[PDB]
Design an enzyme around this catalytic site. Structure first.
Site, PDB file in Angstrom:
ATOM      1  N   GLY A  19       0.719  -1.259   0.000  1.00 41.77           N
ATOM      2  CA  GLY A  19       0.000   0.000   0.000  1.00 41.77           C
ATOM      3  C   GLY A  19       0.751   1.315   0.000  1.00 41.77           C
ATOM      4  O   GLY A  19       0.875   1.936  -1.054  1.00 41.77           O
ATOM      5  N   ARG A  41       9.984  -9.084  -1.270  1.00 38.78           N
ATOM      6  CA  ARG A  41       9.257  -9.834  -2.300  1.00 38.78           C
ATOM      7  C   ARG A  41       9.666  -9.397  -3.709  1.00 38.78           C
ATOM      8  O   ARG A  41       9.023  -8.539  -4.321  1.00 38.78           O
ATOM      9  CB  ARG A  41       7.754  -9.703  -2.089  1.00 38.78           C
ATOM     10  CG  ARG A  41       7.251 -10.579  -0.949  1.00 38.78           C
ATOM     11  CD  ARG A  41       5.739 -10.560  -0.854  1.00 38.78           C
ATOM     12  NE  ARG A  41       5.262  -9.226  -0.491  1.00 38.78           N
ATOM     13  CZ  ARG A  41       4.687  -8.875   0.664  1.00 38.78           C
ATOM     14  NH1 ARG A  41       4.485  -9.750   1.654  1.00 38.78           N
ATOM     15  NH2 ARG A  41       4.306  -7.610   0.835  1.00 38.78           N
ATOM     16  N   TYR A 156       5.763  -2.315  18.158  1.00 37.21           N
ATOM     17  CA  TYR A 156       5.111  -1.531  17.075  1.00 37.21           C
ATOM     18  C   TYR A 156       5.236  -0.048  17.417  1.00 37.21           C
ATOM     19  O   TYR A 156       5.916   0.723  16.712  1.00 37.21           O
ATOM     20  CB  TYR A 156       3.613  -1.914  16.938  1.00 37.21           C
ATOM     21  CG  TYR A 156       2.821  -1.429  15.695  1.00 37.21           C
ATOM     22  CD1 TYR A 156       3.335  -0.527  14.774  1.00 37.21           C
ATOM     23  CD2 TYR A 156       1.534  -1.942  15.449  1.00 37.21           C
ATOM     24  CE1 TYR A 156       2.616  -0.136  13.655  1.00 37.21           C
ATOM     25  CE2 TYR A 156       0.785  -1.536  14.343  1.00 37.21           C
ATOM     26  CZ  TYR A 156       1.329  -0.646  13.441  1.00 37.21           C
ATOM     27  OH  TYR A 156       0.584  -0.261  12.330  1.00 37.21           O
TER      28      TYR A 156
END
EC number: 1.1.1.201
Lengths: 259, 252
Positions: A19, A41, A156
């Site tokens: 995104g 990836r 996080y």
């Protein structure tokens, strides 16, 4: 004047396939910059690179690197050596559900590597380049968890707070130089990650009242680049953070996150 | 009667490690059943098994199986041979974002195996057991995507619709028998996986709440949509809108 003319020939997106990463690639390409796209990836990066070339007519370079792994930043630096660099964005992030004691050290270290170490190596390296030529831009991505904290996923928020505060500092340092630095802090963002956990219901709809698209986040970051140091993406998120800050204790905000 | 007394000794949860699967394991252990817990992540299954034995003092059997792979079902059947079976839930699902043509065939075949083939093999096998002994229960899990469709993730909705309509049919077949079958259709559920994707809020039912509703209605209702808001939302889409509007809404 477009981004290539203002800042330099190549922009580097660190975490390019999801995104917000993808939207950074598209935005800088639309602004005329050639794109170095980095992520784990490789196949997906190659598809995106071909799409960028075909849509925007810019050059691309694909760099496979896993930011949780030692040597990732050095792989990137070797890939960009000799390029005229104008832009960097650190987008990658790694989080992992669990109380602190329930997450094995190997995973904690992976998170440190993504959110802190690879982050800072990249920020430092490209800041050296940008400052030496007195020209460039950095937009790093943080998260509202960096403000609220993130019980049951502590690293996080901790890592995103590191990115936030480091970038805020550097943004101030760069005022009145030719380098423009900004941190954009995201809340809930429409990703396939998100949509695949929204299989139905009015509650699926309730999330879109406060979810932004990756494109709108990137658009706001570029609108404010060189004007504002630290931006929370989206009006509702700004006002929500302000209401927590102004009307509640820190503990209330933490506890709300953990409830 | 608890679940043990009503249906039988062992319950089989196919896809036991994620939120809904875990809730089923806890619920049947609370109802006195021994738990066969099946899934791909064996370490995680073993931890959950330990917790179930520790908390509920029931027996557990962990079966590592990947429902995308051929022979997964037959692995499960070998594990349950000789056990008195009372319950089965098919929880596992596999989806993959992409237009139909952008998803490789191998991935399509994996989804078929998880959502349709392994599903039906298990459903058929355990229904034979329950029907022959005239006691048992099945609660299968579907998704609101099986009602709306799922543009850009087509096989998710399609597979969940297969599960929905198959289970509805069987639920009706079992009325007036000692086997009680139900399908519970879930919308967005409160899991760690969802909450990790909501960094800026809001910060839905829990799996526990969905499973509680399913067991409350087992043997009473055939096809249940979990949660009042979801029931009302599906009603309104069904009654007040065309099928196309609902599909386009999902795609938007």
């Amino acid at each position: 004047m477009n981004l290539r003319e203002k800042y330099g020939e190549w922009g580097l997106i660190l975490g390019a396939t999801e995104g917000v990463g993808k939207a950074f690639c598209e935005k800088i390409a639309a602004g005329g910059m050639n794109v170095v796209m980095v992520g784990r990836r490789e196949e997906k990066l190659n598809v995106l690179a071909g799409e960028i070339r075909e849509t925007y007519g810019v050059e691309t370079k694909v760099v496979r690197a896993d930011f949780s792994q030692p040597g990732a930043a050095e792989t990137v630096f070797a890939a960009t050596e000799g390029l005229d660099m104008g832009f960097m964005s650190y987008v990658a992030c790694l989080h992992s559900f669990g109380k602190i004691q329930d997450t094995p050290w190997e995973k904690h270290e992976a998170m440190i590597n993504v959110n802190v170490v690879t982050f800072l190596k990249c920020f430092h390296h490209y800041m050296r380049i940008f400052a030496a030529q007195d020209r460039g831009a950095v937009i790093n991505v943080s998260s509202m968890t960096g403000i609220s904290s993130s019980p049951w996923n502590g690293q996080y928020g901790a890592g995103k707070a590191f990115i936030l505060k480091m970038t805020e500092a550097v943004a101030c340092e760069c005022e009145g130089t030719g380098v423009d630095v900004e941190v954009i802090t995201l809340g809930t963002t429409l990703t396939p990650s998100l949509l695949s956990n929204l299989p139905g219901g009015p509650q699926g709809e309730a999330v879109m009242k406060i979810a932004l698209t990756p494109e709108e986040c990137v658009d706001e970051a570029f609108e404010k680049l060189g004007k504002e140091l630290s931006v929370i993406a989206g009006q509702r998120n700004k006002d929500s953070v302000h209401d927590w800050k102004a009307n509640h204790t820190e503990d209330e905000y933490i506890r709300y996150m953990g409830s």
